[PDB]
């Protein structure tokens, strides 16, 4: 019981997911971040976790930062069991940003954390 089952009647658990598109570096492939729910009966409370999926968009509509509906399907490639069923919210700003030749979204400033100290000046 969470948002996803609240909106959908799913034939099988995880057959529908709503998420955001994070990155498209792969042709006809949209990566999607999605939330699901965990219950701790000891404390009687819920937590939201998050998970990434590869979804198959033929025809390449999805721009990074789209709100998409996603469904379970035929095995497509090694990691893609999901396809983009519908764009709920497209990214209008991102699309106009692309049309001008710029990247959909600015690339994140820092990468993953390190245990070193990088001294890089000028």
């Amino acid at each position: 019981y969470d948002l996803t089952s609240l909106i959908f009647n799913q034939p099988r658990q995880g057959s529908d997911k709503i998420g955001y598109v994070v990155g498209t570096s792969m042709l006809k492939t949209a990566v999607v971040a999605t939330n699901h729910m965990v219950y701790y009966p000891k404390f009687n409370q819920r937590v939201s976790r998050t998970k990434r999926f590869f979804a198959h968009d033929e025809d390449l509509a999805c721009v990074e930062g789209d709100l998409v509906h996603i469904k379970q399907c035929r095995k497509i490639s090694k990691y893609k069991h999901y396809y983009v069923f519908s764009i709920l919210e497209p990214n209008v700003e991102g699309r106009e940003r692309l049309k001008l030749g710029l990247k959909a979204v600015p690339p994140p400033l820092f990468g993953y954390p390190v245990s070193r100290r990088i001294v890089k000046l000028n």
């Binding site: 404390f43 009687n44 409370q45 819920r46």
Partner: protein, 141 residues
């Protein structure tokens, strides 16, 4: 103010307002006004744990008038059901029915307030009457 701290609820500090105002023997308390809060007040005033109450249709708050008898209060203890808003306790009808029973004798002495699917604020006695389960709010006696 931070993460580890409990997440307070209008019910939580409603109960603690009343408790502290009862300890200082005050006649009036100004207290948070939400649906289930003034629900709780009407129920307490039904059972006579409280002298009176009013909502002035002021947005934030409304007021409760406390009752004292024989020099101490009419309220022994008043406690909220949950410390957080992130925790929600559900009361099965059989549980609310257990409360009513003290080793074979019917006990209405203590009152428990709860929400219904129907948005009603009820004591556990009417709840058991119509056999509906509800979400816990507070106990008082």
């Amino acid at each position: 103010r931070r993460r580890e701290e409990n997440l307070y609820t209008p019910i939580y500090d409603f109960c603690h307002r009343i408790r502290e105002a009862t300890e200082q023997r005050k006649r009036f308390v100004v207290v948070p006004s939400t649906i289930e809060t003034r629900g709780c007040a009407r129920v307490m005033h039904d059972h006579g744990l409280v002298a009176g109450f009013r909502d002035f249709h002021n947005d934030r708050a409304f007021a409760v008038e406390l009752k004292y008898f024989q020099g101490d209060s009419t309220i022994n203890v008043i406690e909220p059901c949950s410390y957080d808003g992130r925790t929600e306790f559900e009361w099965s009808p059989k549980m609310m029915r257990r409360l009513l029973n003290t080793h074979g004798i019917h006990n209405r002495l203590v009152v428990y307030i709860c929400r219904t699917a129907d948005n009603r604020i009820i004591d556990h006695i009417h709840a058991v009457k119509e056999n509906i389960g509800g979400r816990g709010l507070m106990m008082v006696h």
